[PDB]
């Protein structure tokens, strides 16, 4: 059932993820150092700005993405950026202590670190529950990278102009994912896996909404906006 075109799409998305996700976390030394109010805001703002650039690199390699206009590519990335970053960070999240382990003690982030960047339990509690539930899915890397692409290319993002073209690109990705689960994911892990994965996308939309709320309250203080980066201000708002 898995056509050669569908196998082609998976190979590209796997390669795109490997070219944009460094599992050594080497570049983290270039950030402003972490201090453990809002002592973690400089470091974590540098982390998000770094990851936005990686999300852009990944999106450019999604089949069909560069058939969209630059206006549509911009609005899809603006809307999905924080969702894809939260989804990507599942690779560093660990159940042993409910933290994001990125190679060393300096770059291990727990719930208190996120709150030392200006965010509250309104976001942190659903965020942790998202990371746990995603880990319980035990996704193949093939499914992990397909979910990242489906999240970016969604027709209902605000500001989309050629939703019909966005929908066509997403449908080709969704059919690849559904057929992949069918032929390559054995039961019982296969059980309603596609529906469970789309529920995680719905979880990410809610997390996106709460983050935007807390970001605007954060960046409304000029002393806080001083600590952000120019790319973060362009993407998330000034």
């Amino acid at each position: 059932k898995l056509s050669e075109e569908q196998q082609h799409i998976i190979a590209i998305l796997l390669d795109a993820h490997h070219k944009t996700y460094d599992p050594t976390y080497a570049d983290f030394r270039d950030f402003r150092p972490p201090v453990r109010p809002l002592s973690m805001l400089p470091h974590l703002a540098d982390l998000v700005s770094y990851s936005i650039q990686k999300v852009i690199g990944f999106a450019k390699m999604i089949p069909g993405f560069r058939d969209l206009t630059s206006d549509d590519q911009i609005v899809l990335l603006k809307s999905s950026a924080i969702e894809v970053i939260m989804l990507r960070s599942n690779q560093s999240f660990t159940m042993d202590d409910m933290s994001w382990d990125c190679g060393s003690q300096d770059y291990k982030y727990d719930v208190t670190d996120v709150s030392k960047a200006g965010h509250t339990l309104e976001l942190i509690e659903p965020l942790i529950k998202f990371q746990v539930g995603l880990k319980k899915l035990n996704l193949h890397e093939e499914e992990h990278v397909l979910l990242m692409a489906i999240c970016i290319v969604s027709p209902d993002r605000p500001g989309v102009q050629d939703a019909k073209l966005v929908e066509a690109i997403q449908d080709r990705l969704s059919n690849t994912l559904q057929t992949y689960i069918r032929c390559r994911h054995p039961p019982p892990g296969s059980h309603q896996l596609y529906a469970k994965m789309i529920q995680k996308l719905a979880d990410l939309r809610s997390l996106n909404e709460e983050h935007s709320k807390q970001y605007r309250s954060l960046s409304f203080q000029p002393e806080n906006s001083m600590k952000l980066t120019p790319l973060v201000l362009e993407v998330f708002g000034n």
Partner: peptide, 10 residues
């Protein structure tokens, strides 16, 4: 409007 996003997209 979004010059840095456009540069990374090119």
């Amino acid at each position: 409007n979004h010059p840095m996003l456009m540069n990374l997209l090119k």
